[PDB]
Subunit: 125 residues, 4 copies
């Protein structure tokens, strides 16, 4: 009893083996997330009692926004080290443009990407 | 006026060029969807008036379900040609298991994958 | 002294971070191989004295050949578990077709994929 | 007569459909190359007389070298538009560093990536 069918696709990830039509109970397969996506949780799913266990999630990278940076009077700190796309968990460092200073209540100039979202610092003249 | 920043990531797809920090108005880039995903719409985005145009969508493949097929008394027709994963737009063909016949109001035995969803035929004894 | 430039592409693999134009000595990045490719060695490269260390290799999966199997009078053992593509290190199990037996000096019916190569068993009438 | 087995893997590319164990004569499948790789030739292979036709090639992107650029006294022209990786067919534009000029017999400052190779311009003091 308890065989499973082919393992479920997940967004932005792939299993590391060729899918089969049927799997014995206790069988397992593993996922990997695509390059700039961070795999959250356990990469392995196991077949038990007719069902696969819960696959991991592939957490989204963050893209910097020209519009937001212009609006907030900030720029990337490191011109030769531009993290245009950042992994979830990775930090991006900004600076105030010439003639501006960190606003009160602003997030720090260094900020961390989480699943697509960057909380940008804000500078004022 | 009207330059754009780095192009947006999309689920299950990738741009075909290396991202740049800034793009001139009229610049374009192109997406491709990952292998079993079907690109819906125009693959190209263009920068105009400070904004990228709308990226395409990557339509999901369909995975056959052992549980559903067992419940509906069906199996794949072609044992040597098993579309365990099907592309959006692609058809999958089932048969009634021995001793069963297509129920009334059942979908045809041939059915088409659309963005992850297969409408399965149902057989009754 | 000793900064590095952008990390080298490798066949069938990708780095897990966004490439930068320059890296400080002691910086590191990591590779992942594409889904059915097996990463051989250490996934991490480190920048020292102006040079990246040696990247890993992505070992090739194996595809079964209809022509070879027909010529050798063999078939896959498990009709519902067809490893049409196998990872390096993974085993594939064949059987002699009806009316044939393992030849003398033949490889065992179970055989392991290594970097694209399967050593097929041979059956004789 | 003339059925084919599963289609061949190619470096840095993937087929766009789920592989099957057997294909009828006249069947076809299609490849796509991974994002910064340029597909050379016809993306489609067709099964005839027991054999697949010849798959396309995925032409390699080019990575700029810090060491070579330093040795040749050049830098990227566009600081905000750095093609750290370039597609085959795509051009990269350099400039002489301050205090240098294009050497005689040097390649032009604009140069095209071909299957991994850039022919770099050289500047002299």
């Amino acid at each position: 009893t308890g065989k499973c069918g082919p393992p479920p696709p997940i967004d932005n990830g792939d299993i590391t083996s060729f899918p089969l039509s049927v799997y014995a109970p206790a069988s397992s397969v593993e996922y990997q997330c695509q390059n700039l996506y961070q795999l959250e949780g356990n990469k392995r799913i196991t077949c038990r009692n007719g069902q696969w266990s819960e696959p991991p999630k592939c957490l989204h990278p963050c893209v910097i926004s020209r519009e937001i940076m212009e609006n907030y009077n900030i720029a990337l700190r490191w011109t030769a080290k531009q993290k245009l796309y950042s992994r979830t968990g990775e930090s991006v460092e900004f600076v105030c443009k010439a003639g501006y200073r960190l606003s009160s209540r602003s997030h720090t100039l260094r900020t961390t990407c989480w699943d697509g979202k960057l909380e940008y610092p804000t500078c004022a003249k």
